[PDB]
Amino acid sequence: IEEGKLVIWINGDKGYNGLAEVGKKFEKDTGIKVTVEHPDKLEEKFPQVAATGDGPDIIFWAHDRFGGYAQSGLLAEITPDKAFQDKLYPFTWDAVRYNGKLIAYPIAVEALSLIYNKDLLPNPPKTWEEIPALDKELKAKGKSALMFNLQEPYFTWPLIAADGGYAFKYENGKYDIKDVGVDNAGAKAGLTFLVDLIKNKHMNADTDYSIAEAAFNKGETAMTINGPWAWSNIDTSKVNYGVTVLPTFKGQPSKPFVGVLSAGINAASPNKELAKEFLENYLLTDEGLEAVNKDKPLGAVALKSYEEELAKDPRIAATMENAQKGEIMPNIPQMSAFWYAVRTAVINAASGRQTVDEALKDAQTNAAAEFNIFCSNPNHRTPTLTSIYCRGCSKPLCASCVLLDSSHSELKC
Numbered sequence: 001i002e003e004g005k006l007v008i009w010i011n012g013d014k015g016y017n018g019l020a021e022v023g024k025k026f027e028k029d030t031g032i033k034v035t036v037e038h039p040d041k042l043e044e045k046f047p048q049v050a051a052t053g054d055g056p057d058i059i060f061w062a063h064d065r066f067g068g069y070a071q072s073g074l075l076a077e078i079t080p081d082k083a084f085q086d087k088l089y090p091f092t093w094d095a096v097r098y099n100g101k102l103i104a105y106p107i108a109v110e111a112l113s114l115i116y117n118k119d120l121l122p123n124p125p126k127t128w129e130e131i132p133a134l135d136k137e138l139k140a141k142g143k144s145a146l147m148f149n150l151q152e153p154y155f156t157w158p159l160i161a162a163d164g165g166y167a168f169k170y171e172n173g174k175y176d177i178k179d180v181g182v183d184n185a186g187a188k189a190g191l192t193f194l195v196d197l198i199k200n201k202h203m204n205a206d207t208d209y210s211i212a213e214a215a216f217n218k219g220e221t222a223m224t225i226n227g228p229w230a231w232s233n234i235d236t237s238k239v240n241y242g243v244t245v246l247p248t249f250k251g252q253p254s255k256p257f258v259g260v261l262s263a264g265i266n267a268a269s270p271n272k273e274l275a276k277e278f279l280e281n282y283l284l285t286d287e288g289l290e291a292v293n294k295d296k297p298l299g300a301v302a303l304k305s306y307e308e309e310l311a312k313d314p315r316i317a318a319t320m321e322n323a324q325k326g327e328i329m330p331n332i333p334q335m336s337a338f339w340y341a342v343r344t345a346v347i348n349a350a351s352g353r354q355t356v357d358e359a360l361k362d363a364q365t366n367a368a369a370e371f372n373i374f375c376s377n378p379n380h381r382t383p384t385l386t387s388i389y390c391r392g393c394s395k396p397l398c399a400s401c402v403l404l405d406s407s408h409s410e411l412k413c
């Protein structure tokens, strides 16, 4: 890692040209070059390069994969003064909390929404159940009802969760990673519905992101599911669209995993003060967030001043409606073994290589297999096994401590 400059990694579906502008504004003042890159599979190649002291100074991803980075000692703990912490929403600070330590700067809150073409669909559907009847009607016009990304489980999980599928059992502000809910009734129900759109030719089994994006933005399909980042390409196309709550399924609402975009500082960086000065005083400002958001939209930003300006956007409001009905994503290291397990099950059940009951069984057992962890109470003079984490601080706590010792509550920590 070069001393005296900054190298930033951020996923290619964000506004990295905007961050580049914030880099050139940092460079004008300080003379410090700021190089912004968007590598493919950067969420996976960062713990590779960081393990030997390589990689970027700053890493950008949704918060869920940061606990694994921190567990492997790849992220510097970040130390904003209470004055700066007050500038960002408390909701977003909890998402970047791990083992009680802040390990990333929260940037923005993402949530999947149902996006619809107002000209084809005056009143978008409130339920999943009526989409097949809707597509059948639109098929008489040579158009489709719904196309979205079936290759990444993020996009399909809201429906899988609607009737009661979950990743880890959440209780009084605690996760239990031995209570995995991938092959329960609610998830089997939700997944069986999705594939029954493909069987009845309402969706194609191999729709990826680019295909669904091109098809909605070209006016071929009336609906798609996506996050705020996608609005930039919908806006520059000539589609007249709106953003609304994901439709219910079996009367229960669709529950997307809520993502907090976060900026982590490499533990092996010689530029931790420059990275902190860049993020705190250039990115997390009205001017800085406005340059990134104006490239590809960020969603509801973590900074109270700028969010107070974006809150009047109906698309932000819709994202917040879906964010409320969903749940914040865990950040514990097991989350990525879970994302792999669920990715394989969905693509196999949608393609027909497996049945839904076959695919969810394999994923449930595959997942739980990776999931040895010890309670974080120091008064245990011997490592005490547990599978419970506290949600707020992402801290392990043994079953004994969870019941008798009222240190960690859902309301307050």
Ligand SMILES: OC[C@H]1O[C@H](O[C@H]2[C@H](O)[C@@H](O)[C@@H](O)O[C@@H]2CO)[C@H](O)[C@@H](O)[C@@H]1O
Residues within 6 Å of the ligand: 011, 013, 043, 062, 063, 064, 065, 110, 152, 153, 154, 155, 227, 259, 339
């Ligand atoms: O598909 C599983 C995937 O979900 C999330 O990735 C999202 C991300 O949150 C969004 O910012 C956007 O880039 O779309 C991604 C889906 O491809 C998790 O962040 C990710 O770790 C997980 O693998």
Ligand SMILES: [Zn+2]
Residues within 6 Å of the ligand: 375, 376, 377, 380, 384, 397, 398, 399, 400, 401
């Ligand atoms: Zn304990």
Ligand SMILES: [Zn+2]
Residues within 6 Å of the ligand: 390, 391, 392, 393, 394, 395, 408, 409, 413
């Ligand atoms: Zn706690």
